[PDB]
Design a protein around this nucleic acid. Structure first.
Lengths: 102, 49, 53, 114
RNA sequence: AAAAAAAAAAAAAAAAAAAAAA
RNA sequence: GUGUAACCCCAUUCGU
């Protein structure tokens, strides 16, 4: 009758309640508990793992590597920005848009 | 306490009150400009202007 | 309070048992109003016939 | 190649030669509305859509009046509209329900955003 | 999953569009 | 160094 013992003990369902921030330190913010700090802790661990993954990849980077995207695209401060394509209108259509606008 | 005039005064701090927490947001990861250049072409983050 | 009387407990179990059955199979209904549509979509992709072999 | 192109312009002989209508912003507005018919009425539920994209062959029209159905099923001529979208704009029942839900989503999002 | 870019809408949301991790 | 600049340089005054 192990379960019978358990059912009697759980007859009362009042659970322990949480304490709040003291009043004289109210402007600082909410008193963080283990449930709240765990959100902040796992966030840091994900980013530091990603930078370590990135920094390792820079070790074996080959400066002589060549890809055909490199010919038409130039780095800007080290960042590989894909510049927007040009529209390449000609004077006849440019005159046509202004007639439509007026 | 009944014989005298002493009355119970409960500390406001000790009492239990609803917390009312709000969703918490975090900054996006910022990669240094030097690292983006150092990274290989395959792993280079490529964005639009 | 439902567990106090076994008869009304069995009454309530039957009412659920009809509801849980409604997912599996469709209940028969008569043409009590003029046919005005399916009241849902008409799916033409489902083939629910039973193959005989 | 050219004979393939002529055969794809029509539904075929099996369905008496329906033609694919030209796509316009009014027809496309109608198709988007019908695909989202599930959320129009909270008390009505619908099956899944047959196809994710829009149908290639379709035709649009109105239901003919029947003399016997004068009171049972007939909309008065003032409430009739030209398009499915305009019908949604007219009825008070749908506008009242849709406005209440859409206000809730923005308010709940505002609590998340702040 | 996620950092972006291009449109509309409401007092932010919504459709498409690329890269990166997996 | 992403966790919700001095130093120097020109010019001014003072003065064992």
């Amino acid at each position: 009758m192990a379960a019978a013992f358990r059912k009697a003990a759980k007859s009362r369902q009042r659970e322990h309640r949480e304490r709040s921030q003291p009043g004289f330190r109210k402007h600082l913010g909410l008193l963080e508990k283990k449930k709240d700090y765990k959100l902040r802790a796992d966030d840091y661990r994900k980013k530091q793992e990603y930078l370590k993954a990135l920094r390792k990849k820079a070790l074996e980077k080959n400066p002589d590597e060549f890809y055909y995207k490199m010919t038409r695209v130039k780095l800007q401060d080290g960042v590989h920005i894909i510049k927007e394509t040009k529209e390449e209108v000609t004077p006849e259509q440019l005159k046509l848009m202004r007639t439509q606008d007026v | 306490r009944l014989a005298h005039g002493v009355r119970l005064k409960a500390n406001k701090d000790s009492l239990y009150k609803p917390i009312l927490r709000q969703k918490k947001h975090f900054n996006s990861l910022h990669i240094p400009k030097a690292l983006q250049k150092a990274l290989p072409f395959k792993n280079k983050p490529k964005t639009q202007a | 309070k439902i567990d106090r009387n076994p008869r009304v407990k069995h009454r309530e179990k039957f009412r659920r048992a009809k509801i849980r059955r409604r997912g599996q199979v469709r209940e028969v209904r008569k043409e009590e109003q003029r046919y005005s549509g399916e009241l849902s979509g008409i799916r033409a992709g489902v083939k629910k016939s039973i193959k005989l072999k | 190649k050219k004979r393939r192109k002529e055969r794809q312009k029509t539904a075929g002989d099996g369905w008496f030669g329906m033609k694919a209508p030209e796509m316009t912003n009014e027809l496309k507005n109608d198709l988007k509305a019908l695909k989202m018919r599930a959320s129009m009425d909270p008390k009505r539920f619908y099956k899944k859509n047959d196809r994710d994209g829009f149908p290639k062959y379709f035709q649009i029209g109105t239901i003919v009046d029947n003399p016997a159905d004068f009171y049972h099923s007939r909309i008065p001529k003032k409430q009739r509209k030209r398009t499915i979208v305009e019908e949604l704009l007219a009825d008070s029942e749908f506008r009242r329900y849709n406005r209440r839900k859409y206000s809730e989503i923005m308010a709940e999002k505002a609590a998340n955003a702040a």
